[PDB]
Design a protein around this nucleic acid. Sequence first.
RNA 1: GUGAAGAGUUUCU
Lengths: 93, 95, 147, 200
Amino acid sequence: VNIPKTRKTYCPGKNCRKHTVHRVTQYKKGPDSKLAQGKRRYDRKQSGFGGQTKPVFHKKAKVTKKVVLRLECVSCKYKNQLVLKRCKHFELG
Amino acid sequence: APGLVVGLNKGKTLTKRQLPERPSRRKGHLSKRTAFVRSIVREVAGFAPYERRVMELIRNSQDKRARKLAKKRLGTLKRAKGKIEELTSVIQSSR
Amino acid sequence: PTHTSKTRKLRGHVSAGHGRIGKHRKHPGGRGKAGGLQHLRSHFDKYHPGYFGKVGMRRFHLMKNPLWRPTVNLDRLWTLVPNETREKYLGKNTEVAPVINVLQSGYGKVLGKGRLPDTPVIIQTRYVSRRAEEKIKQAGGVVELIA
Amino acid sequence: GAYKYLEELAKKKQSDVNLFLSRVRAWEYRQMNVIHRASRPSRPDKARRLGYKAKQGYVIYRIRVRRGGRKRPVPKGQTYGKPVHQGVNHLKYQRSARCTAEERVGRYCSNLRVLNSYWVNQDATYKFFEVILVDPSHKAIRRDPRINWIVNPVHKHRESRGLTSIGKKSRGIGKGHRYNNSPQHATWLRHNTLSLRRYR
RNA sequence: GUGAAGAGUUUCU
Ligand SMILES: [Mg+2]
Ligand SMILES: [Mg+2]
Ligand SMILES: [Mg+2]
Ligand SMILES: [Zn+2]
């Protein structure tokens, strides 16, 4: 849905424990490090013979992910995360 | 050495004394006879091909390239730095 | 012994107590504890909550000897000393105060539960809690730290 | 003496001198039999430090062993089992090629005892080794207290039981935390034997 | 492995 690019909300950060103005952005997953222990373990497991050693998702649906709002306090650099209901369309401002 | 179980110099305080020489710990020292033999062998045998390549990079002042090549050839960086210093002494020995 | 076992009582009872309908088949819900997340969930979640999943840090090559530190409370301190030492000092006025070396009784830290009698005592320990030290000092005694 | 010079020069396998000698000797070795007798050690300093002595009863044999892994010898790559066991190609023998060299020379000289072995050369196809052997029936061996031990029957085919230097390496015989799996079967038995005491 | 030309202290045809 339409969501303002700025919102004034309670700031949980230790230096601003009050309502302040925040810049709003949509959360996006980061890019999957190769050094994470689970990836190191999976790669070690997958080596050698035996084929695929763990489940792999062959399907996909429910492309309505819950929208996560990243709220950055303008001056404090403090960032907060807010969860909204699912929707097919998103637009900031 | 407070005599506690925490802190920098922890532990019970006893009368410290000098431990005797263990000749096994002499290993790694350079005997004069072995140094003489190695200088003769270095005269008879030349340099390995990678050693020549590293020395060339040293002579062209490509210090990072020499370090990357020596580490790549020998494995570890620690062995590379020792080798580059040894080959640097050779280069300056000829100068 | 076998003579008093329930098996002896079931001789002549055809199903040996296992029912005519449901019987005593081989493993009808699987072997061991398999299925805690699926068909055994109502048991695992009721009687063993916390079973599945990970919590906390790993520690590679744990060696427990450097962590050894059994504890004794203040109310047991005077019990560590022989009966003759108790009679000589406990409740008396003496120039010397008894030494209670808690480490030779098998303890690494003195904790503060309980109370002490009002006689001076020297407590030799590797560690001591703050409240344990305050109560030792109120009784006129001291804590001396050792290794 | 000369032995120190030979030891230091043997370390320079990339030098012009050793590269040339390696090329000619590898060519010469490929011309004779897979297993053949050596009149003398090609590396006298290496042979001495591995137990060899220049006396009657000590024998040097040379052998070349095919390099590379162990292809699974199953009929058409067919393993008849689970996918974890379907591998055929990139597999490896648990014993070193030096161990195989000792095994084959020991069979070839069944009257002798394998003492030790050392590398001498390699090309893309073969590794070349020299195997040191001792005659336990020779009087010069049997009266010598420094090599006498090998006459006793407990040392029969020590190479086949992994008892040479390279055999113990391939068995993972060592001290300390890195070799906890130790002699494997004996260690495994100790951990998988249920000990049921007379509780009285 | 050993030799010859060519290419903007080197290795490519
Ligand atoms: Mg029935
Ligand atoms: Mg039924
Ligand atoms: Mg032995
Ligand atoms: Zn703020």
